[model samples]
Target: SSKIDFVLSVAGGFVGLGNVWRFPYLCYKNGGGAFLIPYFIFLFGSGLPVFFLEIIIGQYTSEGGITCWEKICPLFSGIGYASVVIVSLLNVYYIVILAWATYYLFQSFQKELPWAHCNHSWNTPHCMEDTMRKNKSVWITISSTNFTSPVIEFWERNVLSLSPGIDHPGSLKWDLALCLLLVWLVCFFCIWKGVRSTGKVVYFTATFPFAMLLVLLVRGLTLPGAGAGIKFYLYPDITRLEDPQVWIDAGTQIFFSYAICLGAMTSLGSYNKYKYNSYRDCMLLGCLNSGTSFVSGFAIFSILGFMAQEQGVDIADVAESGPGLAFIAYPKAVTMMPLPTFWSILFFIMLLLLGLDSQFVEVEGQITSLVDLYPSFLRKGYRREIFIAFVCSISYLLGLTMVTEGGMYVFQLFDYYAASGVCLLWVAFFECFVIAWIYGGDNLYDGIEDMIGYRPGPWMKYSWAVITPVLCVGCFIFSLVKYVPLTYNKTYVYPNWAIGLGWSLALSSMLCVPLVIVIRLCQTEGPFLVRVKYLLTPREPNRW
Candidate 1:
């Protein structure tokens, strides 16, 4: 409805938990400051090019996610369906993270941080207090074997209540399930009325995290070992570039955080005015998203450095990504602070808000697709609200599987395979190929010039046709070649059957593209070559 709203929605959508939790660990693991080289290379080469392409597709076509491709070429309409499927998977697991943050947020209100001590029934004999480890003399004498932090115990025992393995599926953790329901309720109300409501909600949800990030960064630098953490974060190991995984990891992080190939960008941009300066908008978003991620490392690693210092361990030991960094390492850092309750509250709330914004926008992306597909049916009166509720409710129920005792493994499976970078890479490649090759690159360039009032340079043309797709396929192959099976906590290997299931989840979204291609070919009446020619041909060049 409004330009600022669209910008904020897209901005908020892209800048989420991944910035703080995922990116820093990736940077540190991949030679710290040296990682920036490949990171920026892929960011410009593949990420932003596709990002710009999707936004232009949305604004130019004035359609939602799936229909946008259908509008471009019926042959590639399957890409749209694939994107919708990807976004649907995202909607389910992404909210589970918020549910975790909410549980942590509620726990933070207590006098003593539950994770700070080993007195709870959930604590095993292996649970070790931070204070004992900090004392140089006492810890030097004690043999380290099964030692575990109370913070980790709290995560595995209290929060997750983890089972022996993924095979041993256990009962639901009712508290986390309740937290999941609460999160869905908030999501339902936020976007039930569409962008008007979502835009207003994001004014707070999107901007509030910056305030928290700045506050934490200030406080983190002042901590005892913050300097060492910062050093570890920035220390360059240029030789690490020899490994292909570094480049693949860099590409994956860029895709994950930039919201590339997710269709959320296109869906969000569909709300923009024809003359809106989205080129400028995309530039701002690209920088802001990456900048926030780079800056968040200072806040994150400083505390981790402090934790590593306190435990008399190296920075490498405490450094982690995903759930471990968020739940174990960071919360453990909070326990060392003077006001554990206050800091824990601040951290978890920031996480909750950050995740919530992304979740709603993605859910909104799916809703927008449905509405565009069946405009009169879904857009009428209370139909929008009813549909939003339906989606939220179904997602909440489906998400419950992830709230159970063994759910963390399932969550990992989904996170690893369903929303993996490989799928996005294929989507990005096809988006560029379809738009630049099939739909006609010069034609779309002229269309962009019509809207933005100036044609982008030949870089856009070459990037779409050559650079982006090459990088996508190259990185895609690298990932598959180097792929490792899913594991939990590096100790529990997933069963072969479970791994198969994970691949099934991955291919479920990916197969949508080829499946729809075959279906469309069959639906068309002609000899094989003629049908190919018909489907490849766009029906309405005038729309361009």
Candidate 2:
């Protein structure tokens, strides 16, 4: 792999959908200015430290995701496999999000813009324009309690043609089905030759989004009320710091934003040279990731402020977060601007490129795990392409479930569980336990010192040993205590069966860690406690 390839690739992965959709909202919601206190605190205390540890693990082992854990400690190999499972599930659903961007990307080129008005075939009598409230004339108060832009109506009524819930896995929306195929096709070509090709591809995919954001930023700041939007985003409610949920939310943001425990981090790091200074890579990239979140905060909220202005409502009212902000709220806001089509095209194209950068990395992790485990099978040449195609094909088939009328429900379910906080905490707890205690921190220090010619600082040592694990474990327990049932749009409750299936998916991945330990103990030739002890003992194998 090319130098700086793994670095930029992992950085790009971290600076992904969460930066765009999740982080800004969390910052805005959780005391804005005050939120950064906990956010950066968690970043330094947990996120950055753990991220660096994972990179060192992959690089020092000179192996892929699964092999890294298996090489270091067989007992925790299930953590590797579980991470693999989560990354795979994420890859499947993630491309569907790209499909959505592709869908909107196609619509961006429309002359009149399909989502610009309420007269479309998809619109109903109940449909109303939120932007109409801007005029403030005789009809000063546009009073439609259910008002939304035609863009949102178009998203729901036209593109989605969405069914009520998970019960109706109705016929696929052929348009989105095709869009999904196209997104997968793009992902295949991006990583078909593995890191050799991925390195070259990410150059464009990763860097271009910054250019788009700068352009959007220049445009956004010029819009009316842009200051007000930026103000609301930067505004600090010092009182919110008193709320523990705010602190938890900040820590959670740091955790998810770094994209740890998904196997992609280690997999990307595995491509680096054995002696590479990933410690520095982690710092620069961590700064890049966090800095981008702040910049993106200004970019997204400024435009949202304009939307709030156009709607003659508070920014909070117009600030629909999550994927909804990108797909619905922004689209609604774009139509009210001059050269709406140009801005819309620019916006969705940025999303498409950003989505592409993250997609193949996950797919590549699947490849890395399989080839590391079965070198003979995925050796090279045509076999590599075949394996790539096979993974993409199966993912595509499974992803078809998302294009159905009830696909949104399935999408929601996957979104809630697959790459969630609880899962990451389990991964972190097991990771630190094995390394800092079982494998020994001094050993890790000496190993890295041998490679890089200097021992890692005590902060890195103590971080891996104490701070990071505690934060992850504490956050996990906090979330469990505050657990809430699943709901869609905060209105539609999932049926018991659907909720059961969601929990099943979560447990399935996690249970693999313990399940492997049990079977290993049974197969070992020793007393029950002794065999169990042997399995849990962490020793770097001469050749795992």
Candidate 3:
């Protein structure tokens, strides 16, 4: 029962940031209000099913994500390891973003806006001018070639863009660094105590954002242009469904939104007590995530509409795509609102808290996996808090490089290549294939029932065996076939080497999954037979 509670807490912690920060912005840009139609469809069709499938595997095996698959099918352990690598790499970037949110939250207390001036007096580019250019898509024109546009440049220049004023009297860069250090400290403090600390942390991280959202919605809807934003958000254009790209975006959103294949779900689900109703939990979480997305659409679009009105541009032109929407677009809105400083403080505080929950869960997932594999690390009188602190310290040092001068470039390279791409899809495809066809879905389903007290229904059975793998394969191939090199301003481009490196990183992660599978198979053989086979057969094919 304690384990079940831990899993629930982990789920809450895992489900932040992406849900609140990224998803709403993405939905708005893709279709204004129209994006929801496809988003909801994919939530049920893909996100929910995959969520349940992962839960079934973790609970049935009661093993960590990567190792659990090894025990279940032996051949798919590699996929689990790949998930571990990808999730680890992603955490490096994600925590840095969290650091940025924390830095901004602290900076909001200053009386004058550090990024607002136009003369470049603060030794940083003016935030207002940057916002103007982004709204006009002028930056796209400058940096579209070579994928080094003004949009990219903006981030490059202003990372610690807010300088301390004469009255404020502190270095912005130092402040930013301090914020990052604090973030790592908090992460280490919460998780080093192990599940108990994480459980207590999530009780707040998971629930507080909703309270913030309610406050934001109440104030946001009272703004003059808020209704226009709401209209632009929810007034769906059903005809947009005919566009294949819209559908593809919808599927990609679902995949990314649910945090599947990142090992978080599997690790969290694995900690559940055997008798917990994971199936019900899966449905509840899925619905909760989707409902929040819907509600957020209103809040996001209303603010965006207010921004559009201020800029004297159509709502469509002012809307942005990708992470820029949050870092650039939303901040512009906050600056323009009445009592801007008060709202700014609240907004960034919410952002920091949202990211705090997600980062906490991600690092915890990594810690849990390690603990499961090497219990002695904890049992050998190595304090759990000490172990967590060590991990956080190391990860934080590594993450600092991402906040350095060239960090965003590195961040983009990893984001484009590592996160939410074909490599992840392929790994998941192989995982489901092994689980469905090789390990035997029915067998796994029976194990789940034994553990959880009921079998997944026929629909879940069908999804695990047939639908999930097929959907992953179809979407993956479609992405590859339709792959367009990302362009800036429709002209500048990434060099071949950059593209190659991206693919190499992705493929390398993908390869890790199968490598683990082979190792598992080798270990599965009897000791005496293993010696004979080691001499005669290559390790991978021997198991088959």
Candidate 4:
């Protein structure tokens, strides 16, 4: 018997924003039709397997991934801890971006275009000026960028701009501050009530985006140049398939987009009843996620075709990467649409809802672990709402620094290094290594069976133990060897401090695993205790 399949399916579906917007664009850009070749290949090899592994781990232990590992194999407890921390760190940044989407959602309701051209009365020149030199002062100045100016104005008018960066000249400090505060408030309100409230919230946040996507698809496809955009998006280039980098990108996209190894799925799965069949849900969610990506590709490219027609540029030129595709290109496209404001509002609202689902899950994973680890905090009748408030307040204060004048720069840096680069690959590598090689894969599988009532097939065992780890390691090495700088614009090189901050963020999370393992070894029996105990004490009951 399944326990609330809709909730599980939606929760699994709402893994990350990367999947919502980024993956489709990447597929369209890389090899168009041919990109799916490597993508579908890796989806089977990497994405689906790890997703199943997490689900099995959660159902088997009937607990969150963090404690499940701690009980099953105490030594890898650090890996679980690291996974939670990385997710939390990611939430901090993710919510900030969500706030941006929210701000855009509101802005879309306005009568006039915001980013079409500069509106400053000071003759600062528009961002669209062909020969405009990159002026750091103007770029940083609020008045020079009309969109940012209004954002700053909104924040200053509100009380949420309490951080130091909010006062900086030429910065949209107030807007960023207010946006962050709004996100925290919304998240706190939605989640402070617990699973019931979270489930209800997902009902809207999860489904509304797809509705908006349908509208965009219909509207975009009707435009004259839409076919060109669809062509650029779906037309396959066979030669690119031979490029190893393209294959690696496809695998990485699948892995990162699925949101495996982040512990959210495991945390969400832990709430399921004992009889829930996770294997089936896992496959359904994977297919659903990929299906959404395929559908989104059509909608997104259809609009891109219109944009290409308007700008009189090739789709390739206007086709962007990362958040720019949403913030810049999408806005540019909506402005050319029949009812620019209407479509813009709908688009941004969809973005906000999509991000809302993902951000909550990320934050919820950490909150769930904290509750599980310290049951006394809630067991003694302490108000969970108050606990949630306190947590958000702390996160808010830490996030204040990110909303400062230099905050966006700092945020981008952390996003680059702390993202899948350092967190996912490293964590996935160790997770599979510990579960498959060190912790006995059969035992883990047995634990799942104890709760879910069905054991995974032979394919699950083989992939978990052998294929997954090899793919992760190969992808990581390839990414490092063929590193490319992620930038908003081609000329904006991040400062050294920004780069250093990113490294520190990545190192802090990466180092947690080894540091905790070492401390556990030094304090208890000995360093080799984990291997000896698991191997030597064969019949001993598994106790995290």
Q: Relative to the true structure, how large is the alpha-carbon lDDT of every model?
A: 0.79, 0.74, 0.64, 0.65
538: Cα error in model 1, Å: 2.1
lDDT of 2 by residue, 1-544 (tens): 5656555663545467777766775665554577777788888887888787788788878766677887777778888888877777878888888888888889788898888888878997765665564554214465555556676678776887879888988889999999999999888887874443455666566667787678667667887878998888776777866655566667766766776787767766777777767787887787788888888878777887887777676776664433455676567556766889988887788787666766766677677677677788778778878888998999999899988878888987776667665666677767877888888878888877866668878887787789877877776666567655666654678999998888777777788789877777778888988886787665553222
lDDT of 3 at 279: 86
Alpha-carbon runs more than 4 Å astray in model 1: 1-14, 25-35, 136-139, 193-204, 238-245, 319-322, 336-338, 375-386, 541-544
Score every model by TM-score: 0.91, 0.88, 0.79, 0.80
Which has the greatest lDDT?
A: 1
Q: Which lDDT tens digits does candidate 1 get at residues 59-177?
A: 98876678778778988898888888888887899899889889999999999989988889999987677666666433467776556678878888899999998887799899999
Candidate 1 overall lDDT versus native: 0.79
Task: Give the least accurate 10-residue stretch of model 3, judged by summed lDDT.
Answer: 162-171
Alpha-carbon RMSD of each model: 3.0, 3.6, 7.2, 6.5
Model 4: number of clashes? Answer: 6
Enumerate clash totals for all models, in the order shown.
0, 0, 12, 6
Top-scoring candidate (TM-score): 1
Tell me which residue pairs clash in candidate 1: none
* 1 versus 3: better lDDT goes to: 1
Clashing pairs in 2: none
lDDT of 4: 0.65
